[PDB]
Amino acid sequence: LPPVVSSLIPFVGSGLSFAGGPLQYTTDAYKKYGDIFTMKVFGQRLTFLVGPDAHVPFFSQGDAELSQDEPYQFSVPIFGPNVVYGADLAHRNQQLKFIAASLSTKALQSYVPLIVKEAEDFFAKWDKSGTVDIRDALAELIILTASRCLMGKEIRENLFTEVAKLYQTLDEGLLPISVFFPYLPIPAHKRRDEARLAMVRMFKKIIDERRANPEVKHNDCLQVFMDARYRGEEQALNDEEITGLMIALLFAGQHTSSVTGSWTGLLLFEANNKKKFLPGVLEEQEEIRKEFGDELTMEALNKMDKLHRCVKEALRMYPPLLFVMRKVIKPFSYKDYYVPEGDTVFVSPALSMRVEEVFPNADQYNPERFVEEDKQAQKYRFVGFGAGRHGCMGENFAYLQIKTIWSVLLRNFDIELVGELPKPDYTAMVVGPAHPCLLRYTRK
């Protein structure tokens, strides 16, 4: 035999995210076999859990029973060394607490004026009338807004173009092959590795300058991460870790929020949906303005229930992450069944939120379904943001970002969907509406 230079058997599960959106295939298997079933690929067992009952083992178990490490291995060379899914549990859990602190109610209270100002300025630059790719526009606004709230005023105001380009290069580094072989030495991965080091060099300058002026307070996630302490350690996080936590929140928060922001508009301003649901949403904006005035405050955004439900219903019908997945560390029972050590378990928010028994007329747009649904006591029915221990920590931020966007648009423009509702684009790990995603707008 000629020389064998390497022999690899990678974890296959993360591959589902780049399988071109096999929802109808998995739906067909659900309708035949029921709420728990297994596919084998190269002898690796992939076990699916559909609907609230089957969700319980997935969302109610913890790190000792279900592991994120294998599913999120792709992220380790993106976020950097000893960051989140590249850290041991002891450090990981502490880092997730620092992120929780940066996205708390208190933190959001301070971010909201910054979100509102970026949105108002952004849409104030629009022509009197025209046609816009809402997905391209909202991706632009959402990276501007995150550069301010996550990274702080220095980077937003001086280095936006530089930091946006570094992020773009990390985004371009995540290929299908990347989830099987995160360390494969290809050009896209070399560019990724250089872009991450370049970002660390950029944050090192801001951090060093902030510590040289420790009286100067900052309303950003960077300040929370600079103040952060590991238990029984006086030394702060190093620059690589602080930078890694930023990149993690860009990956968590950018495409998810911009695709959900985009579907919110494309669905609501579709001719039939617009006739039914727009009047209520416009009425709500008037009632909000009568009670609170014109300032978009935390308090006023929190009262926009009908707009909130329009976002939630876009997320129900077109979740940006088709799968969440865990490696099974400890076997468990679900009803009559046994799920063995070594299985990969999946929940598809896409599948689970088209279950008729949970969501009647699941393929119909009906944001007012959530008046009744929000009263239901049964856990894990709506799983757009996941659930349980590793449930989305950005949920409240996401709702404030998207409701701010559509508040500013609804108050200032008449909007129509151009042509047919876009179909989902299943080419990346975040699913969004296929370009072109055109809305026609006219100032009021």
Ligand X SMILES: CCCCCCCCCCCCO[C@@H]1O[C@H](CO)[C@@H](O[C@H]2O[C@H](CO)[C@@H](O)[C@H](O)[C@H]2O)[C@H](O)[C@H]1O
- Whole-number Cα distances in Å, 134 to 304, 399, 416, 439: 21, 17, 12, 6
- C-beta of 171 vs 193, nearer to ligand X: 171
How many chain residues touch ligand HEM (CB under 6 A)? 23
264 touches ligand HEM by CB under 6 A: no
- C-beta of 305 vs 416, nearer to ligand HEM: 305
Q: Within 13 A of 430's CA, how many CA atoms are on the CB side?
A: 18
Q: How far is the CB of 96 from ligand X (least distance, A)?
A: 7
Considering only residues 256 to 275 of the shown chain, the ones binding ligand X according to CB under 6 A are 259
- C-beta of 96 vs 278, nearer to ligand X: 96
Q: How far is the CB of 276 from ligand X (least distance, A)?
A: 29
321 touches ligand HEM by CB under 6 A: yes
- C-beta of 328 vs 430, nearer to ligand X: 430
Q: How far is the CB of 435 from ligand X (least distance, A)?
A: 6
Q: How far is the CB of 59 from ligand HEM (least distance, A)?
A: 8
Q: How far is the CB of 271 from ligand HEM (least distance, A)?
A: 25
Binding residues for heme b: 68, 72, 85, 326, 390, 392
Give me the long-range contacts of 204-207 (CB less than 8 A, separation at least 24). 204/239, 206/151, 206/152, 206/154, 206/155, 207/239, 207/242
Among 55, 210, 255, 354, binds ligand X (CB under 6 A): 255
- Cα 206 → chain centroid: 26
Beta carbons within 8 Å of 250's beta carbon, 6+ residues apart: 143, 146, 150, 167, 170
Considering only residues 119 to 138 of the shown chain, the ones binding ligand X according to CB under 6 A are none
Q: In this structure, how many other beta carbons lie within 10 angstroms of the beta carbon of residue 184?
A: 13
How many chain residues touch ligand X (CB under 6 A)? 16
**Structure token pair of residue 377:** 């006591």
Q: How far is the CB of 397 from ligand HEM (least distance, A)?
A: 5
Among 154, 171, 270, 305, binds ligand X (CB under 6 A): 171
257 touches ligand HEM by CB under 6 A: yes
Considering only residues 36 to 95 of the shown chain, the ones binding ligand HEM according to CB under 6 A are 68
Report the DSSP pairing between strands 432-433 and 438-443: unpaired
- C-beta of 51 vs 432, nearer to ligand X: 432
Preceding peptide of 436 cis, ω within 30°? yes
**Residue ranges in contact with ligand X by CB under 6 A:** 75, 84, 99, 171, 174, 248, 251-252, 255, 259, 425, 427-430, 432
**Residue ranges in contact with ligand HEM by CB under 6 A:** 68, 96, 99, 103, 249, 252-253, 256-257, 260, 315, 320-321, 324, 384-386, 390, 392-394, 397-398
